[PDB]
Structures are given as C-alpha cells and as structure tokens.
Design an enzyme around this catalytic site. Structure first.
Site, PDB file in Angstrom:
ATOM      1  N   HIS A  41      24.370 -66.079  56.860  1.00 13.50           N
ATOM      2  CA  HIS A  41      24.572 -66.812  55.597  1.00 13.50           C
ATOM      3  C   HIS A  41      25.503 -65.853  54.711  1.00 13.50           C
ATOM      4  O   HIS A  41      25.749 -66.309  53.661  1.00 13.50           O
ATOM      5  CB  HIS A  41      23.068 -67.240  54.917  1.00 13.50           C
ATOM      6  CG  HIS A  41      22.443 -66.226  54.398  1.00 13.50           C
ATOM      7  ND1 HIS A  41      20.975 -65.902  54.672  1.00 13.50           N
ATOM      8  CD2 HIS A  41      22.413 -65.435  53.125  1.00 13.50           C
ATOM      9  CE1 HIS A  41      20.582 -64.971  54.077  1.00 13.50           C
ATOM     10  NE2 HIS A  41      21.291 -64.911  53.061  1.00 13.50           N
ATOM     11  N   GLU A  72      19.977 -66.613  62.807  1.00  9.12           N
ATOM     12  CA  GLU A  72      20.333 -65.997  61.503  1.00  9.12           C
ATOM     13  C   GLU A  72      20.752 -64.416  61.528  1.00  9.12           C
ATOM     14  O   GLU A  72      20.745 -63.916  60.234  1.00  9.12           O
ATOM     15  CB  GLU A  72      19.134 -65.995  60.461  1.00  9.12           C
ATOM     16  CG  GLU A  72      19.658 -66.197  59.044  1.00  9.12           C
ATOM     17  CD  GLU A  72      20.789 -66.767  58.436  1.00  9.12           C
ATOM     18  OE1 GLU A  72      21.023 -68.159  59.273  1.00  9.12           O
ATOM     19  OE2 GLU A  72      21.345 -66.818  57.407  1.00  9.12           O
ATOM     20  N   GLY A 146      18.374 -60.899  46.421  1.00 13.44           N
ATOM     21  CA  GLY A 146      19.231 -59.491  46.185  1.00 13.44           C
ATOM     22  C   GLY A 146      18.533 -58.709  47.468  1.00 13.44           C
ATOM     23  O   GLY A 146      19.174 -57.494  47.568  1.00 13.44           O
ATOM     24  N   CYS A 148      18.115 -59.840  50.903  1.00 15.73           N
ATOM     25  CA  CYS A 148      18.688 -60.185  52.193  1.00 15.73           C
ATOM     26  C   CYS A 148      19.530 -59.227  52.804  1.00 15.73           C
ATOM     27  O   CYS A 148      20.445 -58.396  51.977  1.00 15.73           O
ATOM     28  CB  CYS A 148      19.251 -61.382  52.104  1.00 15.73           C
ATOM     29  SG  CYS A 148      18.417 -63.315  51.742  1.00 15.73           S
TER      30      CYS A 148
END
Length: 181
Positions: A41, A72, A146, A148
């Site tokens: 992402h 991911e 904040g 990730c």
C-alpha cells in the site's frame, strides 16, 4: 531494556531506512545488497526518497501467493551506492506463531520507537482495507497510523513487517527466507 529490545535495536541501527512515497513515510527494512521491503500500500513508483534523497527504483515486485492472493509485501531494489548488511539468515523458513515479539519503527513522526507486542499468532487470512490478504501475523497491541513498515522481531528472528490494525489488534505480513533467494 532486555534481549528482545537488543536484537530489535541491532536490526534498526543497520538494516532500516526512512522511505517516502506519495502515500507517506514508512519504516523500510533492507534485507541484503540493495534489496528492501515495504508494505504494498506504499504504492512504490519509479522514484522513491530514501533518508530524504531522491533514489531510482531498479525493480519493484508486489508479492502474491500461488493462489494469486495479496501478501502485502513489495520487494524493492534501490539504485543506492551502498549495500545493506545481509540479514537473510535471520528470516524464518516457514509460517509459524511466536512469543515475546517487538515492533520497531523509525520515521520523522516516530523516531527510535520500540513496542513489546507479546504473543504473535499465525492469523492467516485477513480482509485488509477491503483486500483479501494471506500469511498475516497478529498481535494484541493498539497500533496506530505511522507504524506501517515497522519491523517485527523476536530474539534472533526478523519475522514480519507491520501492515495494519483494527484499533485493538495489529497485523504484519510474514517475511520468509524463500522470498529473497
């Protein structure tokens, strides 16, 4: 404060950079040579900022399992003039559960941040932001925006990168040795 935090610090001090895309600032784990990982992402493009320096992206691959399900994890090869310490020998070979993990973050918003998250479950399937995702680890800590890209470690193992949360639990994508042959 103890041997879990010692291993986490050793990884952060040598094997992380601050990555900035158009989607934000992320903790980025360097694994070996010029190869790093980041949550998919982050939407890595042809150019990324690494410690606030404009860097060409030589390759970016958003990993999916053999069922064509999102994992991911994006593996990025950076046009950087310096290699990372090779930490592939700290990566697990198989999916597993863990005790006594630490989540470590280093950004402009959260410098030198370390969180003891406790027990880590092989959760498996998660609908992450509407996207079916596999190989998810879960920990019962109220992780925030904040975090990730944050690195999840035990003593002697680098087991995942933080990719989301639901307000009470946090979720990481597994790192496996087989991603980096």
């Amino acid at each position: 404060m103890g041997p879990g935090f010692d291993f986490a610090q050793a990884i952060m001090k040598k094997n992380t950079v601050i990555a900035r895309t158009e989607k934000g600032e992320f903790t980025m784990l360097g694994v070996y040579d010029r190869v790093a990982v980041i949550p998919t992402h982050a939407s890595v493009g042809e150019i990324i900022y690494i410690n606030d320096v404009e860097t060409r992206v030589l390759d970016a691959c958003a990993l999916r399992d053999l069922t064509d399900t999102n994992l991911e994890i994006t593996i990025v090869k950076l046009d950087r003039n310096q290699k990372f310490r090779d930490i592939r020998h700290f990566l697990p070979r198989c999916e597993d559960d863990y005790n006594d993990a630490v989540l470590s973050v280093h950004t402009s918003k959260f410098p030198n941040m370390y969180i003891p998250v406790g027990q880590v479950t092989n959760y498996g399937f998660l609908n992450l932001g509407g996207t079916p995702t596999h190989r998810i680890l879960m920990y019962n800590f109220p992780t925030r925006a904040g975090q990730c890209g944050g690195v999840v470690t035990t003593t002697g193992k680098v087991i995942g990168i933080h990719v989301g949360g639901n307000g009470a639990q946090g979720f990481a994508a597994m790192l496996l040795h087989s991603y980096f042959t």
